[PDB]
Scaffold this active site. Structure first.
Site, PDB file in Angstrom:
ATOM      1  N   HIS A  39       0.811  -1.216   0.000  1.00 26.82           N
ATOM      2  CA  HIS A  39       0.000   0.000   0.000  1.00 26.82           C
ATOM      3  C   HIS A  39       0.844   1.266   0.000  1.00 26.82           C
ATOM      4  CE1 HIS A  39       0.526   1.054   4.279  1.00 26.82           C
ATOM      5  NE2 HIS A  39       0.018  -0.099   4.677  1.00 26.82           N
ATOM      6  N   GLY A 140       3.143   5.578  10.724  1.00 31.56           N
ATOM      7  CA  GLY A 140       4.525   5.409  10.329  1.00 31.56           C
ATOM      8  C   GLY A 140       5.100   4.048  10.670  1.00 31.56           C
ATOM      9  N   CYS A 142       4.055   1.088   9.686  1.00 26.12           N
ATOM     10  CA  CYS A 142       3.866   0.056   8.670  1.00 26.12           C
ATOM     11  C   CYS A 142       5.206  -0.459   8.179  1.00 26.12           C
ATOM     12  CB  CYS A 142       3.045   0.603   7.489  1.00 26.12           C
ATOM     13  SG  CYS A 142       1.345   0.953   7.952  1.00 26.12           S
TER      14      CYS A 142
HETATM   15  C1  LIG Z   1       1.384   2.674   8.377  1.00 20.45           C
HETATM   16  O1  LIG Z   1       2.342   3.319   8.709  1.00 20.45           O
HETATM   17  C2  LIG Z   1       0.062   2.998   9.050  1.00 20.45           C
HETATM   18  C3  LIG Z   1       0.090   2.449  10.481  1.00 20.45           C
HETATM   19  C4  LIG Z   1      -1.341   2.624  11.188  1.00 20.45           C
HETATM   20  C5  LIG Z   1      -1.630   3.887  11.322  1.00 20.45           C
HETATM   21  C6  LIG Z   1      -2.155   4.161  12.917  1.00 20.45           C
HETATM   22  N1  LIG Z   1      -1.862   3.110  13.636  1.00 20.45           N
HETATM   23  C7  LIG Z   1      -1.295   1.994  12.643  1.00 20.45           C
HETATM   24  O2  LIG Z   1      -0.926   0.905  12.947  1.00 20.45           O
HETATM   25  N2  LIG Z   1      -1.044   2.361   8.327  1.00 20.45           N
HETATM   26  C8  LIG Z   1      -1.966   3.205   7.582  1.00 20.45           C
HETATM   27  O3  LIG Z   1      -1.811   4.365   7.600  1.00 20.45           O
HETATM   28  C9  LIG Z   1      -3.142   2.606   6.819  1.00 20.45           C
HETATM   29  C10 LIG Z   1      -3.098   3.111   5.397  1.00 20.45           C
HETATM   30  C11 LIG Z   1      -3.399   2.003   4.344  1.00 20.45           C
HETATM   31  C12 LIG Z   1      -4.512   1.075   4.827  1.00 20.45           C
HETATM   32  C13 LIG Z   1      -4.828   0.062   3.714  1.00 20.45           C
HETATM   33  C14 LIG Z   1      -5.445   0.744   2.495  1.00 20.45           C
HETATM   34  C15 LIG Z   1      -5.085   2.226   2.341  1.00 20.45           C
HETATM   35  C16 LIG Z   1      -3.756   2.667   3.006  1.00 20.45           C
HETATM   36  N3  LIG Z   1      -4.258   3.199   7.545  1.00 20.45           N
HETATM   37  C17 LIG Z   1      -4.775   2.503   8.737  1.00 20.45           C
HETATM   38  O4  LIG Z   1      -4.328   1.451   9.063  1.00 20.45           O
HETATM   39  C18 LIG Z   1      -5.907   3.137   9.587  1.00 20.45           C
HETATM   40  C19 LIG Z   1      -6.570   4.333   9.339  1.00 20.45           C
HETATM   41  C20 LIG Z   1      -7.478   4.531  10.363  1.00 20.45           C
HETATM   42  C21 LIG Z   1      -8.527   5.677  10.640  1.00 20.45           C
HETATM   43  C22 LIG Z   1      -9.396   5.605  11.871  1.00 20.45           C
HETATM   44  C23 LIG Z   1      -9.267   4.470  12.810  1.00 20.45           C
HETATM   45  C24 LIG Z   1      -8.263   3.381  12.533  1.00 20.45           C
HETATM   46  C25 LIG Z   1      -7.366   3.467  11.245  1.00 20.45           C
HETATM   47  N4  LIG Z   1      -6.388   2.617  10.770  1.00 20.45           N
END
Ligand SMILES: *C(=O)[C@H](C[C@@H]1CCNC1=O)NC(=O)[C@H](CC1CCCCC1)NC(=O)c1cc2ccccc2[nH]1
Ligand SMILES: *C(=O)[C@H](C[C@@H]1CCNC1=O)NC(=O)[C@H](CC1CCCCC1)NC(=O)c1cc2ccccc2[nH]1
Lengths: 298, 298
Positions: A39, A140, A142
């Site tokens: 992603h 951040g 991920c």
């Molecule tokens: C990667 O760095 C992040 C780590 C997330 C963010 C907050 N806590 C974590 O573990 N992952 C993301 O930003 C994803 C983005 C992708 C998801 C799959 C498809 C599109 C991109 N976002 C989330 O994981 C996310 C957003 C969100 C909004 C409100 C409640 C929970 C939530 N989780």
């Protein structure tokens, strides 16, 4: 009895920063491959992602991969499940002896929580029966890797991917298979109800005996099939592999079924008392952790 | 909220195996010096030890010091408080930028639990008000280091020394001062009564608020002076440094006095409910931890 992580030194050397266009996350550099969530290449996360389209428009020069202070030269990238394998021209000369393994329900491992390509925390965790974990990840995180150390080699078992609306955390194996079948898509996904890991609660109470905490222990036994019927209606996994506890049952002289009886009773609450410093049944510790921490056996 | 450790890679490179005669424990190799507990040279551990005598009969050829697979060459040794500084010919080329710091009561740090000169686990702990820690050590853990990572350097804060009759663990600073004034003698020593860390319980409750877990939160304020008179008689520390909580009070809209009030009532029991998954008040997490984990800020 303390929940510990296995040391992180071998893994730290493999963590890198993966930038693609307007997204930054972490990658794992092994040999000449960097593994990271796919992603990272999604150009718009407002709505359903067509990853075939995203991959078709992907351009290699939009990648930046940084190991500490050095840029790695990207030469290719292929998509595998929910991961990318990014071929770089440099080989990681600190690649440890390793393999890849997919966790089963209840299995323990270690998370190295990384931000901007740099490790910031480490902790032990169990893959829950609903295929999520309670990490501490914030934005951040991920690409942060989960691992186990075993016979002088690093088993890589988890790559961090998403946080569910509940706050629970979902990752993938390094084969690109998301734990629990969750999707790397923006919409709300809901996990199954969690189950307390019975085998770990048994190990917890054995640990309690071995430390002299026995106020809860009673002579009555609850047969396994009778316990499993109770477990199915009260949020506990079934009891399996009673043979696994033989070393602990021999050393204590307490059979498993007497601890199953205690679980059924202690689930209703401790009544102000504490077991090894806990006010409720704990399912964090596997049998192997208990024997290791109390005896030094692997 | 998850208890985490800071990564261990920088410290793993400094752990060595120290053997004197038939006693084996861990050493910390920094520059051209190996630090370890001085009881490694005590020839008889069954009765009062005259360390001046033991130092006078020490024979350096009895030392074996191994880093991984290399032997280090002892050129001298001196005794400083309850530690030995063993001068070797070899400089540890992986010595991180570092300092020695002495923990204050309540302060959090990380333990790298080692055996035979090899790290086996890593976990976060707090120095308790009675100057012991709740560790998980068995024979051979002595010399295991405690550390913090700050500002690009390693702060070395703890060298593991003894386990008390109660099971609590006692160490020294690397300047040789035993935390709590306990002695490296084989007789029974009893620690004073532990107190709940109020500032940590307040941090805990703020973390609960920040996670929308407020079933326990009421409107009444309890002034600091009044809380403190209750705390001194109920096994809790006094409230201090309420200015650090100002940012959480402001961010949350809930003043510290409403949480002190909640501590007083919740100490009597949670009435079967939970806060962030805990069944009783939790003093394991500092305000620093809570802020770092939820908001990424040091
Ligand atoms: C990667 O760095 C992040 C780590 C997330 C963010 C907050 N806590 C974590 O573990 N992952 C993301 O930003 C994803 C983005 C992708 C998801 C799959 C498809 C599109 C991109 N976002 C989330 O994981 C996310 C957003 C969100 C909004 C409100 C409640 C929970 C939530 N989780
Ligand atoms: C060093 O590796 C060990 C670490 C102890 C061992 C068990 N769990 C630990 O954390 N430390 C010791 O072996 C000391 C050695 C003594 C030498 C003479 C001067 C004092 C220290 N022993 C103990 O810490 C010890 C012995 C003992 C006997 C009965 C109950 C508790 C207990 N703790």
């Amino acid at each position: 009895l303390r929940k510990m992580a296995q040391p992180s030194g071998f893994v730290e050397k493999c963590v890198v920063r993966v930038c693609y266009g307007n997204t930054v996350l972490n990658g794992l550099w092994l040999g000449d491959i960097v593994y990271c969530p796919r992603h990272v290449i999604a150009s718009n996360t407002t709505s359903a992602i067509d990853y075939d389209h995203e991959y078709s428009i992907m351009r290699l020069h939009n990648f930046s991969i940084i190991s500490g202070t050095a840029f790695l030269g990207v030469v290719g990238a292929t998509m595998h499940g929910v991961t990318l394998k990014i071929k770089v021209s440099q080989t990681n000369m600190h690649t440890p002896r390793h393999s890849f393994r997919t966790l089963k329900s209840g299995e323990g491992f270690n998370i190295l929580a990384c931000y901007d390509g740099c490790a910031q925390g480490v902790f032990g965790v169990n893959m829950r029966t609903n295929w999520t974990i309670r990490g501490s990840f914030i934005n951040g995180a991920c690409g942060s890797p989960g691992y186990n150390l075993k016979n002088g080699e690093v088993e890589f078992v988890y790559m961090h991917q998403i946080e569910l609306g509940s706050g629970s955390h979902v990752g993938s194996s390094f084969d690109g298979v998301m734990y629990g079948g969750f999707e790397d898509q923006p919409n709300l996904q809901v996990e199954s109800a969690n189950q307390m890991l019975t085998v770990n609660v048994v190990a917890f109470l054995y640990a309690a005996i071995l430390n002299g905490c026995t106020w809860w222990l009673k002579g009555e036994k609850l047969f396994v099939e009778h316990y499993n019927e109770w477990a199915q209606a009260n949020g506990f996994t079934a009891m399996n592999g009673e043979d696994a506890f033989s070393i602990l049952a021999a050393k204590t002289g307490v059979c498993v079924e007497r601890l199953l009886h205690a679980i059924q009773v202690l689930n209703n609450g401790f009544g102000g008392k504490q077991i090894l410093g806990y006010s409720s049944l704990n399912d964090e510790f596997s049998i192997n952790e208990v024997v290791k921490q109390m005896f030094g056996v692997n």
